[PDB]
Amino acid sequence: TSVAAKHAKGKKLKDVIFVTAGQAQADAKENGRENVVNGTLGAIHDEEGNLVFLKTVKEEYLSLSDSEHVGYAPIAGIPDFLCAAEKECFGNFRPEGHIRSIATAGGTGGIHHLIHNYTEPGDEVLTADWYWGAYRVICSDTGRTLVTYSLFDEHNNFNHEAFQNRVNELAAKQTNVVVIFNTPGNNPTGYSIEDKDWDSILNFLKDLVAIGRNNVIIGIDVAYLDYSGEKDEVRAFFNKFSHLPKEILTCVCYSLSKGFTMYGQRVGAMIGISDDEEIADEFFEVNKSTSRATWSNICRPAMRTMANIVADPAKFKEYEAERNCYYQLIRDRADIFKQEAAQVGLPMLPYRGGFFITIPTDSANAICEELKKEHIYVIALANGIRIAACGIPKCQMTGLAEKIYNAMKSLGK
């Protein structure tokens, strides 16, 4: 018994991420925090367990005028914010061509708008077989289908044959092919596309476009950019989108959730890049329209907060340095998990950065339910176990790769 539209009739979300986090904090309220390890949600908590609100960000944010907290922001977002995000995102790497940006609600809004405006209903959207689960829903809630290519070959190199084969397949059947790359610090694996592999990607994508029947739209979910590596090394690939043929458009979906540790402020920028000023202006206008059509403006105090900080050299250096403490702090946790994981013999995907590390298993769900017994609370995907290294203090990181590998060995995994 349903009154919903034809395409909406059967929708129900199974959300593993959020309940699984719930029994976590549920075991950590009543029985004490330190007998529970929380590997669920992508939020940074410090060595003592508290959620990190970077104190430079919070200080700006709390000091704002009534107008910045409750006033309206323009539809496209605050122009200072739009310039500050591109500044932060690009670093010394800002590509040439025409760049135009629109404020979005997180990376989610970015991905939603990109898919709404650049694909037709029924179209397939491409990403790596290791990917953030929501992409599924962003496509499927709209009549699009998310399809995948094997990210890794046998030795864990970017798998170019798998990618090119899948792209050629979408290209044969639809004019626009949208491909989402989530890099650097891929969610779940932590993997980052290398500079040489971007070269091979773009060179292939330029060859495809020269045939003359397709446009390619390259989405890049950069959410983990500030958690992936040295400042210039992780951004250097941004130079590689300069002066691409106009049949290729690039959309960098940048977010403040991680970089500024504002999660529930819901704020991002989608940043379009084109050799062609008209194509780039169309990116701004069509995505501006979808914003008005959806949330109509994004959160003001969070936009104003990150613009203020980035424009004040003292304040911005103070913020880079507080964030880098927390990221050095994460990088080490993954060092401790990487070293013990290797000695004990536990398989784990090739992490270069990011909040998560994943253990490949076909059994993840089962292996997770017995982990929930140990007071170890983690996320189960179709491909394996995802663990939030952002959330796990040094205390429980060491000897953790043992407690997981020990659960799998008992069950035949």
Ligand X SMILES: O=C([O-])CC(=O)C(=O)O
Ligand Y SMILES: O=C(O)CCC(=O)C(=O)O
Binding site for ligand Y (CB under 6 A): 18, 21-22, 41, 43, 71-74, 263-264
Query: Is residue 51 part of the contact set for its own copies (CB under 8 A)?
Result: yes
| Cα–Cα distance for residue pair 138/144, rounded to 1 Å | 8
132 binds, among ligand X, its own copies, ligand Y, none (CB under 5 to 8 A by kind): ligand X
**Contact between residue 304 and residue 68 where contact means Cβ atoms under 8 Å apart:** yes
- Write the Ramachandran bin of 261: left for phi over 0, alpha for psi from -120 to 50, otherwise beta: left
282 binds, among ligand Y, ligand X, its own copies, none (CB under 5 to 8 A by kind): its own copies
Query: Is residue 23 part of the contact set for its own copies (CB under 8 A)?
Result: no
Query: Is residue 262 part of the contact set for its own copies (CB under 8 A)?
Result: yes
Amino acid occupying residue 94? R
- Which residue ranges make up the site for ligand X (CB under 6 A)? 17, 41-42, 132, 134, 187
Terminal CA-CA length for the chain: 43
For the record, the structure tokens of 260 come out as: 């500024």
- Between 74 and 360, CB nearer to ligand Y: 74
Query: Is residue 187 part of the contact set for its own copies (CB under 8 A)?
Result: no
Preceding omega of 184 cis (within 30 degrees of 0): yes
Query: Is residue 243 part of the contact set for Cl ion (CB under 5 A)?
Result: no
Which residue number is nearest to Cl ion in terms of Cβ? 143
Please state the closest distance from residue 104 (CB atom) to ligand Y, in A: 16
Binding residues among 125-154 for Cl ion as defined by CB under 5 A: 143
Please state the closest distance from residue 151 (CB atom) to its own copies, in A: 23
Query: Is residue 122 part of the contact set for Cl ion (CB under 5 A)?
Result: no
| Count of residues of this chain found to bind its own copies when the rule CB under 8 A is applied | 83
249 binds, among its own copies, ligand Y, ligand X, none (CB under 5 to 8 A by kind): its own copies
Amino acid occupying residue 31? N
For the record, the structure tokens of 208 come out as: 């495809």
Binding residues among 152-181 for its own copies as defined by CB under 8 A: 176
Burial grade of 96 (CB within 10 A; 0-12, 13-18, 19 or more): exposed
Preceding omega of 313 cis (within 30 degrees of 0): no
279's enclosing H/E stretch is helix 277-292
Please state the closest distance from residue 65 (CB atom) to its own copies, in A: 9
In 132-263, DSSP assigns E strands to 145-149, 176-182, 215-221, 248-255
